[PDB]
Amino acid sequence: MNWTGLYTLLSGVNRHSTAIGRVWLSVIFIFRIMVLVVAAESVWGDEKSSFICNTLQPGCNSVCYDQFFPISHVRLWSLQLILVSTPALLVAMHVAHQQHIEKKMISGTLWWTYVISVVFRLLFEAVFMYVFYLLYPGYAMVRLVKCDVYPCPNTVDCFVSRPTEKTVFTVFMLAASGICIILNVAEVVYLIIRAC
Amino acid sequence: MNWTGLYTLLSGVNRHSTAIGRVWLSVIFIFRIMVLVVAAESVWGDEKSSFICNTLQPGCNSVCYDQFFPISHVRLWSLQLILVSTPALLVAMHVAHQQHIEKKMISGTLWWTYVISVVFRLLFEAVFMYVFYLLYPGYAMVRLVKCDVYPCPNTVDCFVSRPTEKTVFTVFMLAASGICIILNVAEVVYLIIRAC
Amino acid sequence: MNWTGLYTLLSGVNRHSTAIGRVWLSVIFIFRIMVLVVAAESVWGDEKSSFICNTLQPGCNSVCYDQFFPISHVRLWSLQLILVSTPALLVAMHVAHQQHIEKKMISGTLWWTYVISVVFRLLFEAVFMYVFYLLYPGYAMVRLVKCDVYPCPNTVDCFVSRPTEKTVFTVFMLAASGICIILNVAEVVYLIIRAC
Amino acid sequence: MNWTGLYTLLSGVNRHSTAIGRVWLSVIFIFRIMVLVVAAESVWGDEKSSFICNTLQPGCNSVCYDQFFPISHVRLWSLQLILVSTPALLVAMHVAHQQHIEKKMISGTLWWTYVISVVFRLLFEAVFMYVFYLLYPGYAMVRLVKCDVYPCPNTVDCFVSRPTEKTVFTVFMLAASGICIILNVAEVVYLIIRAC
Amino acid sequence: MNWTGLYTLLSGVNRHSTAIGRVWLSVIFIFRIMVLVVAAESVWGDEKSSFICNTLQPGCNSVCYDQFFPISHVRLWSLQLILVSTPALLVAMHVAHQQHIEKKMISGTLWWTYVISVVFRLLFEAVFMYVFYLLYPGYAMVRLVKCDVYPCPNTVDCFVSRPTEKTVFTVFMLAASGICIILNVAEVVYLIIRAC
Amino acid sequence: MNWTGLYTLLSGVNRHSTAIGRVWLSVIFIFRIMVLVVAAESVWGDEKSSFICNTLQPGCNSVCYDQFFPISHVRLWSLQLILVSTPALLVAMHVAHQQHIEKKMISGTLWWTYVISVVFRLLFEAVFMYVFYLLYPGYAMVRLVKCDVYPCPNTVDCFVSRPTEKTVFTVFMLAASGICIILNVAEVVYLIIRAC
């Protein structure tokens, strides 16, 4: 493994991306992948097993955990990464297909599809940011929550596992997503300006 | 690892597949594999260990879990992926075998076997969709289930683990399967139209 | 990794195998390996930890589990795969050795050893099918078993984990083994017919 | 894998780094990675599961663990490694991009960006050292802690897991970080002296 | 990965080994490695956690398990494999060193060192077989054991986990070791006969 | 992977090491790595979870385990391996750097740095042997220990997990370390004798 191969793999074979989406976006993507890898198994490993409520009612822990955590942060970020990386994979596959068909026997089409893929990537980033805002208002996570879902009688106190570490990693991931959004907007603006 | 090698591996050495089954089907397959990888161990890891029923009867948890989950969603999707990818593997092996035998010493046969493999892939997709509909009517998963299987006395309340996250991943996987079905039908129609 | 390398590795360097044992047997072997990988850790992971009996007698769970599951299905299938793949490994090593010794300085010997290896593979398949029939009569697995082994007093009710999913995977593996047996018999018959 | 490839990968393709940041910094980075790998899963694997307090109050263990360990040492060191390695990754990607753009169709710019990246690496090292000092004053870790956080009544005695082994690994990691800081300062001074 | 590379790696670069130690010994070594891999984590994974004794005395389970299992079968077989494979590694390293020193600037020495390594391998096999016989007389493993070690009062009944599956794997490993011993003796005899 | 590449990687590109540190030291290093890999997860996996004391005092198990095992044998051996392998890594990186700088545009310096690295390796081996002697006097490990650390009242009996298997692996690792020390001393003596 060399740098001239890793850089080519990350950037794809596309020849229209500038240094914003070729040197900086790949680094932020690697940063997000590494943070998700080092945080998924350890911090969020025992989010449900150590989630306890102050009650004797059977089945209250599971219903309260599902009520307060419809989908954990780790899985939300994994889905966000997959959806954000899908258009880049599509562009790389399209470039490879065009190269194959021209070998066995265009610039504007590649430029347009790259612009469309960057727009879709920005849209996915914004959609996942909005979903995270809807599900979990506020970056901070609290230690104690009040759960009144059936079958729990009245309201019970349930305790979250590692609120502070999860808050730190949430801040990191949200900052990375914001940087990605800014870089995508800058890339779109730069391409439009240079094309005109 | 380069893009011109990954694309060749995903598309095989077949020269009859169009851009529908060469650029889009491979991307959807990668998407399904990644979602299954990020959801199998985490979301469905403790589906049975944290499945509890409100009873003192020994052995009621296991019989109720088997009654309500004959085969978990993760294993159903893994089997679906294996069966769907089997015809592509067969086509790739047949192409390699034909290349080997012509090297040590046809187009219509390859075209027909590719069409048959795509038809079988579509059939497997439809069969697994129908099986999922039969076993689990409705995408949504409920928190509480009523289990009256022996040895549980009368009817007991059993609680499912992470209904909402499993519902989200079920929606994702079903949408991906539907997209695969549509793409396979489009590929078959395109091949038939172009052949005539 | 390319297709022309994977196909060569799976088929070996043998030049006597026809398309039955070169295109179809390898695919079925890959199918069995993938099914075993996706079923070994998940379905059979907690076969003993969640095996409970309705008694207060210490040590009854372990003796009952050993009585009813002398060797689990996953380990039986792993041993079957290893024993079935051993003759192919022997043939590949013999071909490599012959190539090496002819390089540093025959067809009938290779043909005979390939026929013998296919016969041994068929014999191993049949032996493991018969062993599975002896140990576990019937593909279906029951939820409740009656265990009267010492030290359990009288007869106790013990509950198996995931009978239905294990039944489904047993059906899959038995069908794959039967297909392998049929393909091996067809390969032997084809070789004998073509040699005469 | 050979030495001339591993050395090139670790040093990047940059031609301005001297032997301080090319022979010694890479070795210390490998040392830190290996220590973190051998200490993360074993020593810090059960930091929360075996963290017990001398009370009957539900939820006191989790709140006390979060109070005394806002973010564990392993995750702090992983984040420190990622942030420290980010500027080197940026420099390598920039060098690859410059090589690509000069191939498809400068020294001062590379020198300045390398100096800036080394300065940022030193700044990140210092910031993480200061954060570790703020969160955990003193290298030594105590066996018993006094926790008076809600809902724990009055003050409870909580017991930390493996204080001595964690102290040893903390000493190792802090010494490695100090060596990295000294090497970065020496590299900056050497570059400035040689440039003038 | 091809067959001509795997065969060369398994056989080393030694030019004195015949087909007994080049085609058959490597296959048996691969068989032993695969069986150990598929049996180490599953069958022997919970040998101590599910080892229970019929007593209320604290610490009796651990002392009884250590009394009856001084070193588990899996670790004994792993050590046996490592010690048996050490002389082959030494021979390969010596051949590589001789090739390097002759490149930068004998047959009898290589023949003698290969014979000595085969003798040492046979000696290690015999020693480990004798150790296994001393520690565990008889291939069969019993469900119930009588433990009278301090602090257990009088004699307690302790129950072993999966006696039958462990017996099956013990039979497999002992048969493989016996085959290895026979092949090593045959190789030594063949070399001595051909040398004279 | 071939032997001529593995041997080159293990020996580095250094041209001053004799057969003692090129054929035998690498084999012993591989032996130690393999033993540590096969013993770390299995034997020492549950050293603390199954460490129980005969008392009702909360938190006595953790304090007693930390008192009697300040740092486990596995982590001590891992740190010893890392520290022993550090000078070899430094020498390899220095050789690669010298090759790079001579390519883009000495024997005594390489000889001296190799001698210094071997001396440092011997010093690290001796230091870790002395540390192991200080922490754990005697190779044998006892089943029962007497713990009188706060908060345990008076003196309690605590039971160690797998004393005999840990004793066996301790003997193996200590013998390997002694062999490494002897080989390093022999290498230093041989180099000094041949240089004069």
Ligand SMILES: CCCCCCCC/C=C\CCCCCCCC(=O)O[C@@H](COC(=O)CCCCCCCCCCCCCCC)COP(=O)([O-])OCC[N+](C)(C)C
């Ligand atoms: C389904 C699960 C997915 C999970 C998410 C994965 C996401 C991220 C994962 C992966 C992204 C890729 C990472 C490495 C990229 C570098 C490639 C490279 O430099 O290639 C170059 C060198 O490389 C080689 O010659 C060897 C290539 C080895 C790549 C890694 C192999 C698999 C790693 C498995 C890891 C297992 C652990 C992974 C997790 C279990 C190409 O060779 P070259 O000589 O340059 O070519 C000719 C030269 N010329 C072009 C000038 C003519």
Ligand SMILES: CCCCCCCC/C=C\CCCCCCCC(=O)O[C@@H](COC(=O)CCCCCCCCCCCCCCC)COP(=O)([O-])OCC[N+](C)(C)C
């Ligand atoms: C049984 C369990 C199965 C599980 C499901 C697996 C399903 C998915 C898994 C795998 C699908 C394949 C993934 C990688 C595909 C890219 C290949 C590629 O680009 O090859 C190219 C580069 O590549 C190389 O030179 C190195 C090839 C490394 C591939 C990965 C090695 C194993 C990874 C193990 C991962 C471990 C973790 C996996 C999970 C434990 C080919 O080389 P080239 O130089 O281009 O060729 C000559 C050039 N010319 C042709 C122009 C003349």
Ligand SMILES: CCCCCCCC/C=C\CCCCCCCC(=O)O[C@@H](COC(=O)CCCCCCCCCCCCCCC)COP(=O)([O-])OCC[N+](C)(C)C
């Ligand atoms: C002990 C445990 C065993 C478990 C059961 C294993 C059973 C199944 C496992 C393995 C079976 C083999 C799988 C891959 C086969 C494809 C090989 C191939 O295509 O080679 C080709 C390309 O390939 C390369 O250049 C790179 C080869 C990488 C192969 C994978 C590396 C290890 C994966 C580790 C995975 C880790 C996870 C595994 C589980 C932990 C050969 O190269 P080429 O350029 O074509 O050659 C020259 C070209 N010419 C010939 C035309 C002149």
Ligand SMILES: CCCCCCCC/C=C\CCCCCCCC(=O)O[C@@H](COC(=O)CCCCCCCCCCCCCCC)COP(=O)([O-])OCC[N+](C)(C)C
């Ligand atoms: C997302 C998770 C990240 C975790 C943190 C990772 C951080 C650290 C990880 C990785 C850093 C890299 C480690 C190896 C670097 C050596 C490369 C090398 O020497 O290349 C050379 C040889 O190499 C080859 O030909 C094969 C390259 C294989 C590299 C490893 C493959 C993936 C390993 C997966 C590991 C799985 C386990 C990992 C953990 C799951 C290049 O080839 P060459 O012939 O020299 O080139 C032509 C020669 N010429 C230039 C003179 C013309």
Ligand SMILES: CCCCCCCC/C=C\CCCCCCCC(=O)O[C@@H](COC(=O)CCCCCCCCCCCCCCC)COP(=O)([O-])OCC[N+](C)(C)C
């Ligand atoms: C410390 C833990 C140890 C555990 C015990 C291990 C014991 C057993 C383990 C390993 C034994 C070796 C297994 C593979 C051997 C095949 C090699 C081969 O065919 O090479 C050939 C092809 O190969 C390649 O080009 C790629 C080589 C990839 C080998 C696997 C990489 C690492 C797998 C990691 C696995 C991860 C999972 C492992 C467990 C975590 C050589 O190339 P070639 O083109 O033929 O050369 C030039 C051609 N010419 C010579 C004609 C001129």
Ligand SMILES: CCCCCCCC/C=C\CCCCCCCC(=O)O[C@@H](COC(=O)CCCCCCCCCCCCCCC)COP(=O)([O-])OCC[N+](C)(C)C
């Ligand atoms: C951070 C965690 C660290 C843990 C401790 C690690 C310590 C030990 C680990 C690693 C030490 C190295 C082991 C293999 C060494 C053999 C290399 C070799 O023979 O190269 C040769 C062949 O090789 C190839 O062509 C492929 C190289 C694959 C090496 C393994 C890849 C990553 C394995 C990942 C394993 C995953 C599991 C690991 C654990 C998760 C070089 O190629 P060549 O064709 O000879 O070169 C040209 C020929 N010529 C020179 C004559 C011109």
Ligand SMILES: CC(C)CCC[C@@H](C)[C@H]1CC[C@H]2[C@@H]3CC=C4C[C@@H](O)CC[C@]4(C)[C@H]3CC[C@]12C
């Ligand atoms: C500018 C940024 C966003 C570019 C990022 C490139 C991403 C999207 C690309 C680069 C290399 C790609 C990987 C290359 C190879 C494989 C192996 C295959 O079996 C599954 C997909 C997977 C794992 C790809 C996923 C997508 C991937 C990570």
Ligand SMILES: CC(C)CCC[C@@H](C)[C@H]1CC[C@H]2[C@@H]3CC=C4C[C@@H](O)CC[C@]4(C)[C@H]3CC[C@]12C
């Ligand atoms: C158009 C779409 C459906 C094409 C998808 C291609 C799929 C079916 C192919 C492409 C590469 C293939 C893999 C290549 C190599 C191996 C290693 C082998 O030991 C097991 C099978 C396995 C893991 C193959 C499984 C099938 C596979 C994933």
Ligand SMILES: CC(C)CCC[C@@H](C)[C@H]1CC[C@H]2[C@@H]3CC=C4C[C@@H](O)CC[C@]4(C)[C@H]3CC[C@]12C
């Ligand atoms: C026609 C069908 C049955 C052919 C199947 C081929 C099988 C038997 C062959 C093809 C490739 C082989 C593998 C190639 C390389 C290795 C790595 C080695 O360290 C252990 C054995 C192992 C894992 C081999 C096991 C046997 C294997 C899987």
Ligand SMILES: CC(C)CCC[C@@H](C)[C@H]1CC[C@H]2[C@@H]3CC=C4C[C@@H](O)CC[C@]4(C)[C@H]3CC[C@]12C
């Ligand atoms: C002077 C010192 C600091 C140099 C250290 C070099 C570091 C920063 C470089 C060298 C090789 C790099 C790795 C090379 C390849 C990959 C695979 C990719 O999928 C994720 C990033 C990752 C894992 C890189 C991370 C950063 C890395 C480890």
Ligand SMILES: CC(C)CCC[C@@H](C)[C@H]1CC[C@H]2[C@@H]3CC=C4C[C@@H](O)CC[C@]4(C)[C@H]3CC[C@]12C
């Ligand atoms: C005739 C029979 C006994 C020959 C068997 C060959 C054995 C002893 C050889 C062949 C290939 C070798 C392996 C090749 C590469 C490595 C990687 C290295 O980092 C650790 C050692 C290890 C894992 C070797 C161990 C010994 C090994 C498995």
Ligand SMILES: CC(C)CCC[C@@H](C)[C@H]1CC[C@H]2[C@@H]3CC=C4C[C@@H](O)CC[C@]4(C)[C@H]3CC[C@]12C
């Ligand atoms: C004579 C004896 C002591 C020589 C032993 C050589 C040792 C020290 C060398 C040989 C090959 C080296 C490895 C080669 C590649 C890597 C990958 C890198 O990402 C981390 C370091 C690591 C894992 C190296 C560690 C040190 C290493 C194992």
